[PDB]
Design a protein around this ligand. Structure first.
Ligand SMILES: [Mg+2]
Lengths: 99, 417, 246, 333, 47, 172
């Protein structure tokens, strides 16, 4: 995200080639509990709101950059429930403009 | 303009007019008696009402002394306007932008007069209203000053005083907003090249989306394709990747902002030791500000002293802070803060004091827009730490509005009590 | 219907044709508001001469305050105008021929050829020194307007400036007439001696806040209260309880 | 002596007539100034030394060769505002402001050589501070020469500076030819009054009036009219749309209302137009604190000066490095 | 940067002073602000 | 002044970031309004409306009672001592306060954490937002005392669905 315009090169089968987003996102929804990626740090660096589900053992450094914390244990039922509320809310908003 | 022949015509006509007025007045007085020793030898030769005759004798002899080109353009005497050094390209672009918008408004009017269905007329007037909301929209700040100026022409006494002060504050705020609106693309630049901007970005966006779809389609088939067909798909994918890299490089156009001032704080020569000698590079630290509360800084490293300043000039507009001032000339209260070993003290001052500061702090406060501040730097005087400590102090200041929000009380100036 | 839409065409025309005069008057209002109290107009010599004859023919009603309110200038300026007009008419009375007005008519006919900055009313210069006070939590009451307080300050300073100008200008006017010595070689002894101005110093001889009471005690052994010239001297030599304005 | 300072300050600080060689030199100097003003982004010593020293030198040359820095460091204040306000009440400064003379050295010559009176007190103090109430006059033996000088100076500042720039942008040699014919009109009182009563100067009055109308639009002047008359500009489109519905459900009026709407929305929304032709430096009358009767001539002081009404040719951005003033409120701050 | 406050307040203070252009998410954040909960003294009671 | 210290304690003011909350603090008479309380609340609400730096206002009661009504015993003694001007000035002040609440230009929020009788609902229920707790009790026992549901209670009771307003006002 901080370097989303850097060039890419085709090599092989690899892990498949993918460029960055052409448009800067307005919100980032994170499902990372093991903290494998730097997405929270990059979004904090680039001033983007973050919706993420926080563990009881989250570090302060990662916590303070999260705009919308949802305190829970991310079980399969709660992940489904979260995504269901998000999808239903978004499509209900989309229908109000005739789309 | 006026032709030289026309300018000669008027002065010859005026001399003939004063001669004919003398002749007609002399005759009018002569016809009633009234000998004209006050018209003759008093209005023709020995009047000398200004003392112009020495200048006449000087200029008449000077006008023939040398020769050359009688039509040659020469430099202006009362020259040095000193503000007329304006890039004329934006001036000659905005005029035809407005001309095109006005012509489009006229065509919408001439379509609305030529419509035939009232449903179609409703559609056309909606189109006209959507046009006039985007190209001919008056900002809501102007109607407040409109009502106030309506009251001002009929108010008198104390009310004229109050209305004049309020409209003066409104004039300042509207002028500032118009000159530094970030939404208006006319407040941006091209920085040396290292409504057309929106469509220029849009066509690149559409080309990028098409290239992404084609790349996805070929990458979908590479897994099942084996052999020379796979090799030619690999070459086509590589060519598409080269094209998309070339398109995404073009979206990196740095922009500066008009009206901002950029100054150099530090240029240093740093060196790294290798087995072949010393590797010497350059770092430059630069600051920028718009005199209205927005201030920023950047640091960059290149190989040459010009390229370091160019890189920091490019990156100077990406880390911008807003600083609150008290009555647009001084800070709200005294503030002391430290960054590492650089301790910085700032004190406010009354309105006719001036700014008492060193080079780095004075440049930073001048670009931020302060006018009456005293300061002192105690400890280490590293320039980069001084820049950082000034930005810490200017952001640690609690405004009266901040005290009001923090405590839920009313904060009143003491002379308004 | 056709009359109703004809009247609207006349009503739109009466704005479209007179769009420019609105811009003229609004430009004058902008010049008035960018520097507050500036009148944007350049009072002319014809208006000064009308002011002089209008004050001369009716002094008891068409006074200096009335002239200043009608012509929207400062009372100091009105006093200077009247004094200079009396001097001008005395000069023309001594000459017997009217004076040269070539400069004045040039400034009169073409006010757009020069720059003028005359002032209508005085606006005070404040120091915006930051100093606050936090109200109690259970407080009710309307805080004053900063424009109102600036108005009060400007009014007070204009009163002080007006009376200071009067005290200086009357003394200068009778110095112009010639009742004041203002030379080392024009202060000569009388036939009886010198007069003195005895002042009763001390806290018991105080005429008020500012100095002590005064009397004369003439060289012959008699003493009298002060005259108007001596009273002006007493008024103009007193200390003043303010910082120096302008 | 003095023209060498134009090479120092890269401008026209010399207020005397220029030869062709001096004009050619001044072209190169103005090119050098234009090149210097571009490279300010790469300079460290710009604000604290260069511009401060240039503005100090300009003030020293403006006030007639005086040690501005020394007389300011004598006082202990940082900002230049009270020093300059106090300097503006000096005697020879006032004599320059009233346009009774031409130069600060000429005023110093007249004051030192015992020829100017204050309240009929003949004074010889050049640095004398005048408060409000002082009366400035001359001697009766010199009054006719000073009146002649004032008349000549004003009727030649209407000519050698005013008519040369306004619609008469002729070359220098053509203007030096035509200037004798323009001089010979001014030899008589009749030739002055006829010059004043002319359609030439009336056209030049109207053109300056329209130019000064146009210059106001930089401050959003034309939008103040929209904010003033927003009701009728809505009623115009309201009438056009009501007509376009009523008289179409059941075209000269259409074309008239379209022309009216187009004229109004053109005059209310045309942007500010800027020309290459520069505005001309006019001569300022100090009517905020001095009152003049030009016949005798006589003056009376009646107020204090203003910091923003000093007739200097320095940019506000450069001068605010010395004044440190909160400009915009109209006060002496 | 060196500004103080959280994302919404810092962004609001920045866009009020004409430093940055208005981001799209600012209006959605103003319409739906993040939650707040009172102070807790750091003590968890064993149920 | 030094004379108002009882009424300052009777009507406490809480300040927040952009809001002001008036808290009724009469535990002896269970938050029953008086003419000083209504006048102070009128001044506070007028100033908070006049201020642009306040975004919304609030009304709370302290204890187990929001507001039990108005002070009728003081009016009874004032009638018994002969005069009627105290009662007249009390009624006009209370109805003016209700009218100001009904035409208030900012959001007003009324919290109801207890009993509410008489004008205690008339000062709040024309508000823009009304929050009710589980302990909230709203009743109108004016017919048992011989008075009418004054202070705008003839408005929101009349605009209830059905004949429910008649039922509640008559039966208490
Ligand atoms: Mg050290």
């Amino acid at each position: 995200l901080t370097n989303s315009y850097s060039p890419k090169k085709f090599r092989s089968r690899h892990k498949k080639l993918c460029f960055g987003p052409t448009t800067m996102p307005d919100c980032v929804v994170v499902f990372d509990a093991e903290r494998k990626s730097s997405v929270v740090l990059e979004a904090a660096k680039l001033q983007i709101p973050v919706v993420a589900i926080v563990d009881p053992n989250v570090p302060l450094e990662f916590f303070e950059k999260i705009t919308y914390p949802v305190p829970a244990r991310d079980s399969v039922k709660f992940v489904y429930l979260f995504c269901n509320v998000i999808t239903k809310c978004f499509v209900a908003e989309q229908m109000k403009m005739g789309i | 303009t006026i032709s030289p022949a026309e300018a000669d015509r008027v002065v010859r006509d005026l001399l003939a007019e004063v001669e004919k007025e003398k002749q007609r007045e002399r005759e009018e007085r002569q016809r009633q008696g009234l000998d004209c020793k006050d018209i003759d030898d008093e209005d023709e030769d020995e009047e000398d009402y200004l003392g112009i005759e020495p200048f006449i004798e000087k200029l008449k002899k000077q006008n023939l002394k040398d020769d050359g080109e009688l039509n040659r353009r020469e430099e202006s005497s009362d020259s040095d306007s000193e503000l007329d050094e304006v890039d004329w390209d934006e001036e000659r672009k905005k005029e035809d932008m407005f001309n095109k918008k006005f012509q489009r408004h006229k065509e919408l009017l001439q379509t609305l007069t030529k419509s035939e269905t009232l449903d179609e007329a409703y559609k056309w007037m909606t189109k006209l209203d959507k046009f006039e909301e985007k190209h001919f929209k008056l900002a809501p700040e102007y109607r407040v000053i409109g009502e106030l100026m309506n009251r001002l022409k009929v108010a008198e006494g104390k009310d004229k005083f109050i209305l004049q002060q309020k409209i003066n504050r409104a004039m300042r705020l509207v002028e500032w907003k118009e000159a530094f609106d970030p939404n208006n693309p006319a407040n941006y630049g091209v920085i040396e090249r290292d409504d057309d901007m929106k469509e220029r970005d849009d066509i690149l966006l559409e080309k990028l989306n098409a290239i992404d779809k084609k790349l996805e389609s070929k990458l979908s088939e590479l897994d099942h394709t084996f052999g020379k067909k796979g090799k030619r798909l690999e070459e086509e994918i590589r060519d598409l990747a080269e094209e998309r890299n070339a398109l995404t490089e073009k979206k990196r156009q740095p922009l500066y902002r008009k009206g901002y001032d950029v100054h150099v704080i530090d240029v240093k020569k740093v060196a790294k030791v290798t087995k072949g000698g010393r590797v010497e590079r350059y770092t430059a630290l630069m600051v920028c500000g718009n005199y209205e509360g927005v201030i920023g800084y950047a640091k960059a490293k290149a190989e040459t002293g010009q390229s370091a300043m160019q890189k920091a000039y490019e990156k100077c507009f990406q880390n911008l802070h807003y600083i609150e001032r008290h009555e647009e000339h001084t800070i709200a209260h005294a503030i002391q803060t430290s960054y590492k070993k650089t301790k910085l003290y700032l004190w406010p001052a009354p309105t006719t004091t001036g700014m008492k500061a060193g080079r780095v702090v004075k440049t930073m406060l001048l670009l931020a827009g302060f006018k009456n501040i005293k300061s002192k730097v105690i400890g280490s005087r590293n320039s980069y730490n001084t820049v950082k400590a000034v930005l810490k102090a200017l952001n640690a200041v609690e405004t009266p509005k901040d005290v009001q929000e923090k405590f839920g009380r009313t904060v009143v100036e003491k002379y308004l009590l | 219907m056709i009359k109703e839409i004809e009247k609207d065409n006349r009503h739109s025309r009466v704005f479209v044709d007179g769009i420019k005069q609105k811009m003229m008057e609004m430009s004058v209002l902008l010049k008035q508001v960018k520097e507050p109290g500036a009148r944007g107009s350049y009072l002319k010599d014809s208006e000064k001469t009308e002011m002089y004859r209008l004050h001369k023919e009716n002094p008891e009603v068409y006074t200096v305050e009335r002239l200043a309110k009608d012509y929207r200038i400062m009372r100091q300026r009105v006093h200077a105008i009247l004094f200079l007009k009396e001097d001008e008419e005395e000069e023309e009375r001594k000459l017997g021929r009217p004076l040269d007005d070539s400069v004045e008519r040039l400034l009169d006919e073409y006010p757009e050829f020069f720059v003028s900055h005359d002032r209508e009313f005085h606006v005070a210069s404040l120091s915006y020194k930051p100093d606050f006070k936090v109200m109690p939590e259970g407080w009710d009451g309307t805080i004053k307007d900063m424009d109102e307080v600036h108005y009060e300050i400007s009014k007070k300073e204009d009163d002080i400036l007006y009376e200071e100008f009067l005290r200086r200008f009357e003394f200068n006017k009778l110095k112009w007439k010639g009742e004041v010595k203002c030379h080392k070689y024009s202060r000569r002894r009388s036939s009886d001696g010198w007069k003195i101005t005895v002042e009763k110093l001390g806290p018991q001889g105080k005429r008020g806040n500012g100095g002590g009471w005064k009397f004369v005690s003439l060289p012959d052994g008699s003493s009298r209260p002060l005259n108007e010239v001596e009273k002006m001297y007493v008024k103009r030599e007193a200390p003043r309880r303010r910082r120096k304005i302008l | 002596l003095r023209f060498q300072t134009c090479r120092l300050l890269l401008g026209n600080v010399w207020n005397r007539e220029l030869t062709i060689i001096q004009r050619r030199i001044l072209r190169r100097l103005r090119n050098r100034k234009r090149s210097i003003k571009k490279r300010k982004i790469y300079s460290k010593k710009y604000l604290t030394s260069y511009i401060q020293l240039q503005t100090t030198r300009k003030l020293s040359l403006f006030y007639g060769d005086l040690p501005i820095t020394e007389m300011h460091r004598g006082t202990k204040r940082t900002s230049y505002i009270p020093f300059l306000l106090n300097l503006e009440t000096r005697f020879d400064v006032i004599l320059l402001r009233l346009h009774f003379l031409e130069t600060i050295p000429q005023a110093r010559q007249l004051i030192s050589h015992r020829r100017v009176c204050v309240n009929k007190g003949m004074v010889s103090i050049t640095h004398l501070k005048l408060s409000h109430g002082d009366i400035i006059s001359f001697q009766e033996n010199n009054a006719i020469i000073r009146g002649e000088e004032i008349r000549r100076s004003f009727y030649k500042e209407i000519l050698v500076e005013k008519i040369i720039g306004k619609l008469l942008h002729q070359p220098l040699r053509m203007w030096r030819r035509s200037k004798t014919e323009w001089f010979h009109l001014l030899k008589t009182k009749r030739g002055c009054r006829l010059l004043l009563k002319s359609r030439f100067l009336q056209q030049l009055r109207s053109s300056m009036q329209e130019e000064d109308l146009e210059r106001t639009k930089k401050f959003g002047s034309e939008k103040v009219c929209l904010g003033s008359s927003f009701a009728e500009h809505k009623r115009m489109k309201r009438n056009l749309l009501k007509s376009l519905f009523l008289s179409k459900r059941r075209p000269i009026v259409y074309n008239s209302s379209l022309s009216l709407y187009s004229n109004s929305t053109y005059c209310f929304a045309s942007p500010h137009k800027l020309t290459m032709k520069r505005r001309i430096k006019r001569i300022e009358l100090p009517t905020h604190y001095l009152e003049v009767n030009y016949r005798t001539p006589k003056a009376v002081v009646f107020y204090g000066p203003n910091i923003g009404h000093i007739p200097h040719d320095i940019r506000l951005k450069d001068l605010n490095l010395l004044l440190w003033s909160r400009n915009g409120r109209g006060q002496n701050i | 940067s060196w500004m103080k406050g959280d994302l919404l307040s810092k962004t609001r203070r920045l866009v009020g002073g004409l430093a940055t252009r208005e981001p799209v998410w600012l209006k959605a954040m103003e319409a739906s602000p993040p939650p707040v909960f009172p102070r807790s003294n750091g003590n968890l009671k064993k149920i | 002044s030094a004379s108002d210290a009882d009424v300052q304690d009777q009507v406490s003011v809480e300040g927040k970031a952009k809001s002001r909350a008036a808290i009724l603090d009469r535990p002896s008479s269970l938050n029953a309004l008086s003419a000083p309380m209504v006048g102070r609340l009128k001044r506070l609400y007028e100033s908070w409306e006049e201020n642009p730096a306040i975004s919304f206002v609030l009304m709370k009661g302290s204890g187990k009672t929001f507001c039990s009504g108005a002070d009728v015993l003081p009016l009874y003694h004032s009638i018994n001592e002969g005069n009627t001007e105290e009662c007249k000035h009390f009624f006009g002040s209370l109805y003016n306060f209700v009218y100001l609440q009904g035409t208030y230009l900012k959001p007003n929020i009324a919290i109801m954490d207890g009993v509410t009788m008489g004008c205690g609902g008339g000062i709040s229920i024309p508000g823009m937002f009304r929050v009710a707790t589980d302990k909230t009790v709203l009743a109108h026992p004016e017919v048992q005392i011989g008075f009418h549901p004054d202070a705008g209670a003839s408005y929101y009771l009349s605009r209830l669905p059905g004949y429910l307003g008649e039922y509640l006002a008559l039966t208490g």
